[PDB]
Write a protein that binds this ligand. Sequence first.
Ligand SMILES: O[C@@H]1[C@H](O)[C@H](O)CO[C@H]1O
Length: 271
Amino acid sequence: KDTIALVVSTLNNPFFVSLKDGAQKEADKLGYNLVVLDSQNNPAKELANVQDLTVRGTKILLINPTDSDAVGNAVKMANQANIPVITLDRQATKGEVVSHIASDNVLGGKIAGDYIAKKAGEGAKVIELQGIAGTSAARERGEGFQQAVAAHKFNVLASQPADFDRIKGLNVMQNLLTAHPDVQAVFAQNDEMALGALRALQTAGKSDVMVVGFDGTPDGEKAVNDGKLAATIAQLPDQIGAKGVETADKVLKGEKVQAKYPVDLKLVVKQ
Ligand SMILES: O[C@@H]1[C@H](O)[C@H](O)CO[C@H]1O
């Protein structure tokens, strides 16, 4: 059996658990052996992971970068070892990559902002909880959101990273709340940060603030259904993982593939 490796940025996020499951299901279907390694949001750990795999008989590397710019060295190592690289969800700024599979994050950010404008109104006072700086995903969602900002004349009270993490999201929101009690809406660049922000609002007795997340994870969708989260932009993590293994199969089979494969987004609201 050929071995495909999946190096994921972290497993402490339901989104990446789903991405891993999607890849696992497809590997099983296509008869591949899937090795999963966790970089734990650490570029140093990611590099060590890739160095390790290059001598394990790995046929293809599926990588979800911890950082789009820092991952370059790891990609170049796979390149030297003649192991084809396919990036999933986040881009690699440097190094040779055969294919990239991800959502349109610029569109996602604009769509989230447009929905805020539709509910809280034009000129609304907003806070943005950004993802990990250095990732294409955070960068693109910010750009998209900025389009909605200019379009809807939003007043951005504060924008700050909470690293796609639920606990950091809670703490950052708690601190921002004390300095900006007049916030009307929050765009959280992923559901984990959105759920943390909701807990901060809960602790603070602020039920009047509209929160929009991103991912459509099981927890994210439940909160929308329970009326706590106003909306989330659903991605298809499982399909990103499956598409990665499928593309890996073609490459190994000598079939040529597209350099970029888009996966659809969907706005999710209650009802
Ligand atoms: O697209 C993914 C998901 O939003 C995840 O929750 C954080 O990392 C991003 O790159």
